[PDB]
Amino acid sequence: SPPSKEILTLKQVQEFLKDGDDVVILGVFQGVGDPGYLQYQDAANTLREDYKFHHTFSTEIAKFLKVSLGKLVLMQPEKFQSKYEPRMHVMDVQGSTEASAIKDYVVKHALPLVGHRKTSNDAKRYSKRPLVVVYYSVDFSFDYRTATQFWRNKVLEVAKDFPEYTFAIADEEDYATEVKDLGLSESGGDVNAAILDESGKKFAMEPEEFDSDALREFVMAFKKGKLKPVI
């Protein structure tokens, strides 16, 4: 069946940005016979197990999104946006556009600078290494999202300086046994950090009052090969 699903209303797109937990991938095309749309559906079909795809032919939605027709638009939900990232990544797509280039752009741009690594998404989203993980109580509900973003903001400050590594926040309970195994379950701190490297080794951050500086030092020490792995 059709890999990409049609978006009928502006409210649908608003709900994705507000409620979503994953990259919003949107093909914006002139209509169902648009050669660019067909190339998009080819790309989407290939990636269908790993991402959800949407499309629209609405000039109303294109206007809202501030794009002309014939584009692939990737946006993150509000909870994953930041001062350092554009609200949209936009790629020109026409009949001549290779499906492999579409597929490449989606993979390239599907992760935010600091996303939420979950036991449900870590294989499909957080496979790239090195990966810097920041562990704490992650809760995007109305009552707890300010505090969650408080800490996410400290991570984003470091992440923007190390584009060569992937950074994510992770819930400490969700990853209880990963945290124990990192030797971090004892620590008296509400926030902890680890690095997973390309070889399969893991490095735990010396528990300290958590701030961007301390996180930046840990990543720098990692980069410089000054850390020893957990066993």
| Together in a domain, 87 and 19 | yes
Structure tokens at 85: 């990232």
Instruction: Please state the domain count of the chain.
Output: 2
Structure tokens at 161: 């300086």
The CATH number assigned to the domain holding 185 equals 3.40.30.10
CA dist 66 → 22, 63, 93, 124 (Å)? 21, 5, 16, 30
* Orientation of helix 145-159 relative to helix 212-223, angle to 10°: 40
| Together in a domain, 101 and 127 | no
| Together in a domain, 133 and 216 | yes
Longest dimension (CA), the chain: 60
Q: 75: helix, coil or strand?
A: strand
Mention every residue, 6+ apart, whose C-beta is less than 8 A from residue 143: none
Could you tell me which of 222, 171, 170 has the C-alpha nearest to residue 201? Answer: 222
Q: Please provide residue 140's backbone torsions phi and psi, each rounded to the nearest 5 degrees.
A: -95, 10
Give me the domain span that covers residue 226: 113-231
Structure tokens at 187: 């620590």
Report the distance separating Cα 188 and Cα 43, nearest Å: 47
Q: What is the DSSP string of 201-212?
A: -EEE----S--H
| Together in a domain, 149 and 102 | no
| Together in a domain, 100 and 19 | yes
| Together in a domain, 92 and 53 | yes
| Together in a domain, 80 and 175 | no
Residue where a domain terminates, one of 63, 85, 112: 112
Report the distance separating Cα 63 and Cα 25, nearest Å: 17
| Together in a domain, 119 and 100 | no
Residue where a domain terminates, one of 62, 95, 112: 112
| Together in a domain, 6 and 80 | yes
Mention every residue, 6+ apart, whose C-beta is less than 8 A from residue 73: 25, 26, 27, 28, 65, 67, 88, 89, 90
| Together in a domain, 74 and 120 | no
Give, for 150, the enclosing helix (H) or strand (E): helix 145-159
Sheet hosting strand 202-204, strand order edge to edge: 114-117, 166-171, 131-136, 192-196, 202-204
User: How distant is the alpha carbon of residue 169 from its chain centre?
Assistant: 10
Residue where a domain terminates, one of 112, 138, 155: 112
| Together in a domain, 94 and 136 | no
Q: 117: helix, coil or strand?
A: strand
| Together in a domain, 215 and 120 | yes
**Residue given tokens 């990409």 in the structure block:** 4
